[PDB]
Write a protein that binds this ligand. Sequence first.
Ligand SMILES: O=c1[nH]cnc2c1ncn2[C@@H]1O[C@H](COP(=O)(O)O)[C@@H](O)[C@H]1O
Ligand SMILES: O=c1[nH]cnc2c1ncn2[C@@H]1O[C@H](COP(=O)(O)O)[C@@H](O)[C@H]1O
Ligand SMILES: O=c1[nH]cnc2c1ncn2[C@@H]1O[C@H](COP(=O)(O)O)[C@@H](O)[C@H]1O
Ligand SMILES: O=c1[nH]cnc2c1ncn2[C@@H]1O[C@H](COP(=O)(O)O)[C@@H](O)[C@H]1O
Ligand SMILES: O=c1[nH]cnc2c1ncn2[C@@H]1O[C@H](COP(=O)(O)O)[C@@H](O)[C@H]1O
Lengths: 337, 350, 336, 355, 344
Amino acid sequence: AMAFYFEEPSRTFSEFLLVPGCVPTNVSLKTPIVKFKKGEESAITMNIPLVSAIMQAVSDDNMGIALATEGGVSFIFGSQSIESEAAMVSRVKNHKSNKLELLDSSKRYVVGAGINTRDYEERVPALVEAGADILCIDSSEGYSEWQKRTLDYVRGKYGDTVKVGAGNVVDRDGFRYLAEAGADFVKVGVGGGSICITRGQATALIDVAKARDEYFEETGVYIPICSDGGIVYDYHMTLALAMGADFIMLGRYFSRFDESPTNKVNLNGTYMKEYWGEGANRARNWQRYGVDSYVPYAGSLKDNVAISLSKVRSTMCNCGALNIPELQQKAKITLVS
Amino acid sequence: MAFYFPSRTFSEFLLVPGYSSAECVPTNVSLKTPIVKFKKGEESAITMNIPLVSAIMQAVSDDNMGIALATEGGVSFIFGSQSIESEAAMVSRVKNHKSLELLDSSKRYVVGAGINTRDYEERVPALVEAGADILCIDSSEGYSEWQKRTLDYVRGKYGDTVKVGAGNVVDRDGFRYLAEAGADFVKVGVGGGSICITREQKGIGRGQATALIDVAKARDEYFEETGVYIPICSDGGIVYDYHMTLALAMGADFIMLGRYFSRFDESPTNKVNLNGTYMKEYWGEGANRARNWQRYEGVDSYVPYAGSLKDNVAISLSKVRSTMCNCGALNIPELQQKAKITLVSSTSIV
Amino acid sequence: AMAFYFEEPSRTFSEFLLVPGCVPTNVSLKTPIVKFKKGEESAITMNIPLVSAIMQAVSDDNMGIALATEGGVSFIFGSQSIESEAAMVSRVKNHKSKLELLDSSKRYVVGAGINTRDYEERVPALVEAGADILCIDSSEGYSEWQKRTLDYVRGKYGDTVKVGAGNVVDRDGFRYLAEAGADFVKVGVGGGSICIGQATALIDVAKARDEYFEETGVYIPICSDGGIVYDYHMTLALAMGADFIMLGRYFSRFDESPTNKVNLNGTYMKEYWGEGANRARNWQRYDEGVDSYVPYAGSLKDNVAISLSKVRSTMCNCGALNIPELQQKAKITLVS
Amino acid sequence: AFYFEEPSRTFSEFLLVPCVPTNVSLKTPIVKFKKGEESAITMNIPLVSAIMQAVSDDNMGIALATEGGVSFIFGSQSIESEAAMVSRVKNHKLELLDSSKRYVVGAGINTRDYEERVPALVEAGADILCIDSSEGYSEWQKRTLDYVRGKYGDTVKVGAGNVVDRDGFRYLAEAGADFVKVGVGGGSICITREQKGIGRGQATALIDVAKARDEYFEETGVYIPICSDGGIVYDYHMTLALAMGADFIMLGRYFSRFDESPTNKVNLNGTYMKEYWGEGANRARNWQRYDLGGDKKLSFEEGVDSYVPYAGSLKDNVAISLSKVRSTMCNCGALNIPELQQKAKITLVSSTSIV
Amino acid sequence: MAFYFPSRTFSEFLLVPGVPTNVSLKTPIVKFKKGEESAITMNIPLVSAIMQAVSDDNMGIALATEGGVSFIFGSQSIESEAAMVSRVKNHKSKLELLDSSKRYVVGAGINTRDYEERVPALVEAGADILCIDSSEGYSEWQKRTLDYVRGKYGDTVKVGAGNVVDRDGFRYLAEAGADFVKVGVGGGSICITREQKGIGRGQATALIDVAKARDEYFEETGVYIPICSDGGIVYDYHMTLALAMGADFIMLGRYFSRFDESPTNKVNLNGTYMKEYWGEGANRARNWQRYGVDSYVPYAGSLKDNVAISLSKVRSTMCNCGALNIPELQQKAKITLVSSTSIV
Ligand SMILES: O=c1[nH]cnc2c1ncn2[C@@H]1O[C@H](COP(=O)(O)O)[C@@H](O)[C@H]1O
Ligand SMILES: O=c1[nH]cnc2c1ncn2[C@@H]1O[C@H](COP(=O)(O)O)[C@@H](O)[C@H]1O
Ligand SMILES: O=c1[nH]cnc2c1ncn2[C@@H]1O[C@H](COP(=O)(O)O)[C@@H](O)[C@H]1O
Ligand SMILES: O=c1[nH]cnc2c1ncn2[C@@H]1O[C@H](COP(=O)(O)O)[C@@H](O)[C@H]1O
Ligand SMILES: O=c1[nH]cnc2c1ncn2[C@@H]1O[C@H](COP(=O)(O)O)[C@@H](O)[C@H]1O
């Protein structure tokens, strides 16, 4: 009466370690987020490799202005009305422009917007009109087919004039299916979308990074990878970049800040902030209009990001790497017992 | 510096035997149950002879499984992770297969069919034209507005002639949402204790009964307001017969099983010899082969081989009827009324 | 060959959380400890909801003076001779003396623990020494003998002597001591000289107490005995139905505690032992046995000031200016 | 915060390092005796039943006496009810009989109403008494043993407990106890509400008290019989307990499984089970509120603490258990209990594994 | 704070399927070049360990009738071991492993200390194969021991070495001229210390990694060095998994210590017959020059009865994979990881 299960082994970022082998302020954290051919330059280059998650608790217009000021991009959450998301995008695009400020060709704050695989025919034109610099399908591993239909719609109507990412995927088949559908980048994570959650983020990132590099040799097209979720400590960021991720999406990290849209609460003499995932009914069933957890209040986004990126820049110096591609080439990543 | 916001399994519960000294014959125990909603005092439109249905899975419910389970009085829900044409062909193959047995008006077998929240506008008519007796929304995210829009579509076109169930839910909000949307029966995510169906499935026979008790409490509360009884389906996590009796006693009207049925000859998977012992291949609906059926090796697990469905179901229900005699119940409604369910803190070998 | 056990589920304080929905110094921490009728005023109202345990390692005359100064009551331990306990009670009532808890004669309020054995000689001696309130230091398994001590006090003194009883964990245990005339009911798993779930027991008795409050109109205050690990557990117990809290290890860490201060690996600690230890259960043999050590925390004044300031701060977030307001407005959720 | 605890080990972690089993003498004393002299009461088998409402009544006392053991009628009842149970065993007409050739029975007493319960049980014909305390050895057990030695001297034999240490043994010994009970079942001197699992007794307290008993016998020349209280169901644990120094073993849930137990038999899904509850339960602890059979109005949620598997008759099971106890003694090279305690090579099993 | 720089057992692996009498359990012991035959070829892929409690002269004869070779333990005097090797090689002869003289093939263990006087006495007594029993793993003293035999006997005397767990360990003993390489599967480590692991709890990770290094060394030099899985196996399925993972033959200690031919005493442990046992890490083995029971293993009867049972299931398992000999199993077997096993 025995049953055998054959699940592939997965690991987290805490099971690995960057082994070092000289000015930390001389390290460039610029990274691409739009696919580019060999030798060419990406259409959108961030100044820091941080993006905020596509969640009601993370990415509003206040978060988008703050993160763009530091060199990142916020992906405004799409579990709201089409008019609200476009209005949120429009407020970032019109807030007047911090040496690492990320601006477009018209000197406006760069911002992203999340879309779903359902109302994209009405949602994409409104977000494009609002000035969204880049889009990202906010889905999970098991909805890859409907991510492909959404990418096909964008490419059929806009060609390559609208930048759109897709995710999440965890393996080669998921990466290649979105890659050949025209995804300008690919998000890697065990969650995403309105699916409920329960890491395996390191294994997922390593597997997709191997398929991405293989896809680069096969086609000459470099597709940036976004590691979505699983960053608990600042040394995990450098580890994710070294494993192949070109930028990192974080939710809980940004929900702690002043610019986060959730409420600040005093919980036993310690200031905390409300938090919930997109699997919550208030997010999954936003059309019908409840706290999942609390995260500790951390202060301003600028103060925390500068601390996190100083650790990243100083770690890359110890590895003899002055930029992210150089880190991905010289990094020694070993297991920790 | 971080805080989150309990569940129990069927292994933690026990039925206290009734006080009666009168002898109870297990063969006189009736296992009939309703599967579609009905008003207070009226008879359900569909009544199964046994409280077992097969899951909406590629590795469980094909046409052969549909004929075998209908012969024993149950209903199979043909899986919908396939083309609309191949699903209607499997539905028609069970209906047109010539015929205790669960039959419709035309003495044909009773079969079910799963639907999704995307192509229902063209899949629901094809399945009804194929002769499906009851439908069920197979959702991977739980109760959502897309389950509602699918339910609104069926009601707006067929009224109440076509019966469609929906799920999964675990709490009162989920039940009342699908109940107020017109669902004929509500499915409870017992196997994983969650509303979603994702690639990582829970172990065999490790279902969570807490979700079933919570929805049964909302169903009885809802039945007391509107006078409408919504049949509850306990979905997954059960293989042991005593867990079937517990599920029924806790308020479940019928039980959906996947891995329980994949062990049988009529399962559509391949039988393999694993060092003498016969085994059966298996994979969940969250696997890439099912989730990406439009794009078309692929073995998630080996389940033990258990022979024929007729032999195994007869043994499982022989113990269910015997357990209901010990509780003093001759039918499932009596079980839900007379069951003294206690919580077991621990067990021990002597 | 299986055996089946049917133990009731029991949760600790660490599994619950107070969710908020005001100046902290405006919060009143006063609370009753003697039963009062619907709308009446209790015979003894503490200024802070803290009382010290009935233990050799906790409540002596120095503890009673220090805790009464802050507004609490110490229950002098009864695992000793009748003269020794009465002398310590007398030492507190005769200490000369803003939130100070005083009786009608401007004397420090103190309690005293009695057992279910020598009460016929110990109760009058404690009454004569000036004990403002008594408490039967027992456990769940001695409810009958807790009643007989209550039946003795009520028979000889009526309601002129206030006496509480504990511990109980159930509805059936609360009503038994309530009918016997207990002025308050102590809730806890331990208690007495037995050897050693506090949240579940507190929620259960609070329901039985509230139900008993509608049947009779008499409000019997509840004392949560033991299980307070952190300062935010205090506001949790109060919001769950407890009117005051009994702490043992919390108080033995202070200077005013009678235990020896000990340097242990550079960290100053203090000795500690429970009433189930031989030195306490069999005090008659004694007219060394250290069960555990607790960290030396400093003065009772400075620590109680910090613990209550957090309590007052949490109640402000919950929109409660007093303990009764807290027990009505508090939103308590389960926390994994 | 640092705390103090001693390493405790169960019976399953010990092993006896290695004859006709029928010739083995399972006889053992249960009352103290001076060096060289015999014992007043010599059981034929080393088993006694627990002073519990769910174990020892008149039927249990009769059946266990026919097999050579003694039952201790529970005191969690009226003095009249316990005296009637003791009297029914005596006046009921191998077997363990007294001088009058009546069944030998024991009775439990508490430290509260001993001035009326002890005379009533002695009048009823109790051959031996035992103090049941929920708090462990205390001054109230001393005052109870002082009263018995004052009114009856040594005519009435009384045991006390439970203990887990040297000081506890010497306290009841210097108080005049005829035998001393070791809190093996829960590893504690107390009998509280929650109970340990079936067969999870702590041998550490038995070994520590056996060392104190052997040292007390070396000074005064008085041998105090030791009782291992509970925590044993397996036959090998019985031989282990006897080997570690226990002169006789008291079992609760071992005897509750039998038909001679006063609890209800229940058909649970085709398997016969018996209701069970410990002496820490309110029905036993608050027995003064159900004095005339008020406990049969209690429901399953209120009255039944546990389901134990029905094991049939006492005589059938004890014969199976003792037949293997006698066979285990053969592998150790011992024909009697005293020889076991001197020849037993007891070792610690660091681990067991399947091959 | 104290960062430290992952192994799986045989229980976590499963052979994915694609006449058991037709199956050949023959396997080589000694090195050979691509194309030629092996100097010593087994009939069954089982050897007994180099331990006081497993390999006497009785075990050498019994394992020789069934087709295996026993390595006589070297924790004894040089004359005592030589007399044990002599008795097996002088005991008169269906699957027996015999030399050209039609005498029983037997092995003997040596150490890196007295080899200059112990190796001659063992070869002089007729030991076919030798094996270095090391306590620290692969080291220089194992290389100099190998340099001694190759300098005095050339390649006439065959000597194996171990234990290794890694690629560097295999290549070190390979370049040093070892005839076979032994892998520390039982303890998953390079050493053989006091505390031994559990029966049947061997680590397959060391066997896979060394087989990867053995196949690389074979493709670069054309010299096949047989691999030995040393310990941690009593289950027949773990034998087939080890053979499929690259191991050519398996070394077992507690598996053979349970049989009547074991040198230990048979005891009656409460109606159940048991066998005494102790590892080479015990003082009675490591302090054999100065001159009790570490464990009780279950008595299983005779070697012939149980070994025939284990190998009949090994042949039956090899049929379910589609392999008729051990080389074919190493090429056709599909080995997968079992995330978990559940009971229905
Ligand atoms: O409720 C959920 N449903 C689905 N995905 C989630 C949920 N919560 C978090 N995630 C995923 O985890 C990410 C958050 O990363 P983190 O909070 O920094 O660990 C999101 O961007 C999603 O990809
Ligand atoms: O891929 C899977 N992951 C998680 N849940 C699944 C998966 N496939 C099916 N399910 C659910 O689990 C049920 C099967 O329950 P079972 O009887 O435990 O096999 C199905 O009816 C679905 O509700
Ligand atoms: O040794 C013991 N026996 C019985 N109860 C105890 C013992 N030790 C502590 N307690 C109980 O626990 C309380 C102290 O709780 P604490 O502040 O959490 O240490 C005391 O007032 C008793 O009710
Ligand atoms: O209610 C209980 N709680 C804790 N200990 C108990 C209780 N009832 C009986 N005991 C003790 O445990 C023994 C029973 O051991 P048993 O053989 O494991 O059943 C009795 O003889 C008592 O010493
Ligand atoms: O004393 C010991 N401690 C640790 N390992 C040992 C000891 N004795 C033998 N071994 C190793 O274990 C192998 C056999 O173990 P087994 O076959 O799994 O019981 C031997 O060939 C040695 O490699």
